[PDB]
Amino acid sequence: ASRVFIVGGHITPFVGKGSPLFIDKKHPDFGKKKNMTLEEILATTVQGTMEHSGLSGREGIVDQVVVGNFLGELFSSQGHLGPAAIGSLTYGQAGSKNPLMYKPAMRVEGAAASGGLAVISAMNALKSGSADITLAVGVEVQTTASARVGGDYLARAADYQRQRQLDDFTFPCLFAKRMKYIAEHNHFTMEDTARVAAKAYANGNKNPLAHMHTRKLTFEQCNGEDPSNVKFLGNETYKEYLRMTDCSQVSDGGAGVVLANEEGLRKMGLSPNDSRLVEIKSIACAVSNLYEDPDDACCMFTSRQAAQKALSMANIKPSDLNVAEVHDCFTIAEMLMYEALGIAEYGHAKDLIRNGDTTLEGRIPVNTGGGLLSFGHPVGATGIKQIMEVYRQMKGQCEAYQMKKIPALGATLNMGGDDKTAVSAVLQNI
Amino acid sequence: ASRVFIVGGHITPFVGKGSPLFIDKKHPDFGKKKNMTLEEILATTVQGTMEHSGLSGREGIVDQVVVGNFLGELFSSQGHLGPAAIGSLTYGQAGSKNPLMYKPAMRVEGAAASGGLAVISAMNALKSGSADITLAVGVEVQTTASARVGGDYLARAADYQRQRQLDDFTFPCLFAKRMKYIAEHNHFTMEDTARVAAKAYANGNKNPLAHMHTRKLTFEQCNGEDPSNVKFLGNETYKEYLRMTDCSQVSDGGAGVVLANEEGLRKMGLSPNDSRLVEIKSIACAVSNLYEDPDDACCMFTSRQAAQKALSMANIKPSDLNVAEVHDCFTIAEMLMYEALGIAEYGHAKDLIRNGDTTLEGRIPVNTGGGLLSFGHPVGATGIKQIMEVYRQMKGQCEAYQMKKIPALGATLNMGGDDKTAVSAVLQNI
Numbered sequence A, B: 001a002s003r004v005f006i007v008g009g010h011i012t013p014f015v016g017k018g019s020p021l022f023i024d025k026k027h028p029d030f031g032k033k034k035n036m037t038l039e040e041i042l043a044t045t046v047q048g049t050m051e052h053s054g055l056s057g058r059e060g061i062v063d064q065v066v067v068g069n070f071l072g073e074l075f076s077s078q079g080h081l082g083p084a085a086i087g088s089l090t091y092g093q094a095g096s097k098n099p100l101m102y103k104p105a106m107r108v109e110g111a112a113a114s115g116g117l118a119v120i121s122a123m124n125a126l127k128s129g130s131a132d133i134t135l136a137v138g139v140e141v142q143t144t145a146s147a148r149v150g151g152d153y154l155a156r157a158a159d160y161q162r163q164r165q166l167d168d169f170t171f172p173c174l175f176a177k178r179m180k181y182i183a184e185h186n187h188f189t190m191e192d193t194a195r196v197a198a199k200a201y202a203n204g205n206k207n208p209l210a211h212m213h214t215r216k217l218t219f220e221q222c223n224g225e226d227p228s229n230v231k232f233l234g235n236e237t238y239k240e241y242l243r244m245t246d247c248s249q250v251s252d253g254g255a256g257v258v259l260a261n262e263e264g265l266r267k268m269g270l271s272p273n274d275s276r277l278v279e280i281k282s283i284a285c286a287v288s289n290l291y292e293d294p295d296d297a298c299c300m301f302t303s304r305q306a307a308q309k310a311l312s313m314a315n316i317k318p319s320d321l322n323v324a325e326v327h328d329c330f331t332i333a334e335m336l337m338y339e340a341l342g343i344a345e346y347g348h349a350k351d352l353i354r355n356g357d358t359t360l361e362g363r364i365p366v367n368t369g370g371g372l373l374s375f376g377h378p379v380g381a382t383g384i385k386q387i388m389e390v391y392r393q394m395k396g397q398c399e400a401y402q403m404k405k406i407p408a409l410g411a412t413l414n415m416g417g418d419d420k421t422a423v424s425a426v427l428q429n430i
């Protein structure tokens, strides 16, 4: 087994409605300057990743590139992101010399798990001998359509034939449906989900890259007492179980990471104990059946399978973790992710949230920079953002949201669709 | 280096307008039954692949699944094909036991090179120790939109912002644009491309899986002598250089392959010298810049890079090949692929086609079952179909289009976009 190391990476600001970085009718530059395109975000991500990893001027030592992206063919009319990434180093300098020419590249997809699947592909390439240094980048632009057209696009992650009819906001409806069953079993409550949102927004207020950085929300606002916090679904069966503040943001952004094996480190002139490295101890993927849903909506079975495989392969227990990043696409999902990861037992996520165990001051901080709720959710980027967030904490780089006790062990859990794809990784600080 | 073996596979009939298998006004079942959906095609492909590979009843020994698909999100409103593949063994049998539950799965994409990229991802998993048996499947449904809407969807493979404006049929226009430069340099002629189509259709007439199986074309109906073979492009600059018979078909279908390492063969009860096997000696991927095109339209630089890497890794020369499958998305591309692969020198593909060298009776038969022109082109399936076509000839399984001499060595060359992604493999018979 060849060891795999994160050498460095980059996360863009995540932007959309409500960010002062987003150009809309309220913005000074409206009509004069535009928001970044998918191509521009990909170029900023690739370049920033190479720069932060020490590869500027020697990008030719990267052996291959993997791009995670979910819906570029719909939001930007652009597939084939492999060769877009090959062109990203020199984007806008037509005819410049391009050290990535002719290298392997491809795009991987598994809905919001696309970024995590990109890291898996990159790692297989490292362990198979076909690469010693790999670039994995995840990007998404979703702000180019209305929220309602965007909802139909996102519904590509569901069993579209079977489930699109639930609601124009198909995904929010699928999680409202879970939350209804959850509330009926008293597994946890809408108050508890309001506590998740309060935590996410307080964390994002410490994070200048966060979509909702400037938005301050109290527990009371998240719990439905602000009348701007609407129960917005059309489906009358499920609409009482999802507020706006329960939902991840519609964001644009990118995240990238450079991965290396022991031979890659040697080429870069680095030792395996270099203080800039994090080891990926394990990574695992589990996928369930798109066409059939388990009866027990209180459990994310697929996410749990992936987390168990990863922790087992790394030979650690959930109680060994010092930090985690989980797929909080709704407040509802974070709670379930506590239990999928195993930092709470089944029915005890509510204990963790009521006691502050996952806050920055808690014994197991989760989603320290705002998660999908506040940091934002450019779908393809998210799995790589999670990895880089853990890396940033382990390297002391998080500024106002830096954990005081540098974490030795971390985990990520990245989910696609209604718990149909899951990717989980265990990271160990060097 | 772990060796990789093709254990078996399956190709569906490829269907669309002009096939008696396509349900349209001419078909007995018109109005009563519908053409297969993407889900149904994926289920038929996964089940057929398992069946032909000897895995029926033991599908649990498959460690992972990779799906090639380009445009399901547009043509079928469905992404996230990983969990669709997990549900494909038991499709339509709700509640049945599913030995693939929780295995890794993902979708990979690189336009028409998606099927080839799927094979590469599967092979990296086999060589990395995370898998011993893998399933790679490629599927596409494009008959759900008109050929013109479909053209806009296919333009996702181009630099959409830069190139969509050429023509509604963006890809046919990019290849017409090549052909104009090609014709001006006398590199080869429209007569030569007509000879490619005559070959493809005669091959497809021997192949019951072919989209154009029942369509017989004389050379005169390929060479523009028949005015009903229309020059259909809107762009006046390029419209003279492309006839309908020059174009790959808009098809629906699937192809699958089971791949194994030495450990996988052991699990299956097979020896590495078993007569059902074909070794994949090498596979390689090269990707160029989406945003910039080379000046020399007479050369497919990216395709040539991938073929050279694969031949070199296998330690063979082009003159050692007994059979090949190349990416004939237009008659124009087949000609250029002869020279990318190296079975002709630059400017000499025309010699091969004028002398019959790539016919079934020739010294190096290419696209023996009709290629993308007659077999058809469900884009995600194509890379895997190519592999399976070489396999089928090596195993004597091609019936009316079986070669005169069993091939010992074969190659494939699969391309995405306008020579932006290329995947090439070398196969050796056992």
Ligand SMILES: CC(=O)CC(=O)SCCNC(=O)CCNC(=O)[C@H](O)C(C)(C)COP(=O)(O)OP(=O)(O)OC[C@H]1O[C@@H](n2cnc3c(N)ncnc32)[C@H](O)[C@@H]1OP(=O)(O)O
Pocket: A017, A111, A112, A113, A146, A147, A148, A154, A157, A169, A171, A172, A228, A230, A232, A244, A247, A248, A249, A250, A327, A329, A330, A377, A415, A416, A417, A418, A419
């Ligand atoms: C599935 C996995 O794998 C895990 C995942 O990743 S799932 C992916 C999760 N992501 C998503 O689904 C995106 C979720 N988030 C969202 O869609 C948005 O954040 C929202 C939650 C939709 C945000 O809303 P917004 O940005 O303010 O946009 P907006 O245009 O106002 O849309 C809200 C809708 O609610 C209603 N609404 C909003 N404000 C309202 C008010 N004050 N009064 C009444 N109704 C209101 C409206 O009907 C509106 O749509 P219409 O104008 O078409 O009616």
Ligand SMILES: CC(=O)CC(=O)SCCNC(=O)CCNC(=O)[C@H](O)C(C)(C)COP(=O)(O)OP(=O)(O)OC[C@H]1O[C@@H](n2cnc3c(N)ncnc32)[C@H](O)[C@@H]1OP(=O)(O)O
Pocket: B017, B110, B111, B112, B113, B146, B147, B148, B151, B154, B155, B157, B158, B169, B171, B172, B230, B232, B244, B247, B248, B249, B250, B329, B377, B379, B415, B416, B417, B418
């Ligand atoms: C992107 C990647 O990476 C993938 C690749 O490998 S590259 C992409 C390769 N694939 C393609 O580009 C698809 C190419 N093929 C096609 O679009 C179609 O097969 C084809 C247009 C060549 C033939 O299509 P068809 O469906 O048999 O005929 P039909 O669909 O009835 O009409 C096709 C068009 O031909 C023309 N046509 C047909 N009959 C005609 C007639 N009697 N008179 C004039 N024009 C006629 C029309 O222009 C028609 O389109 P519109 O009606 O929209 O104007």
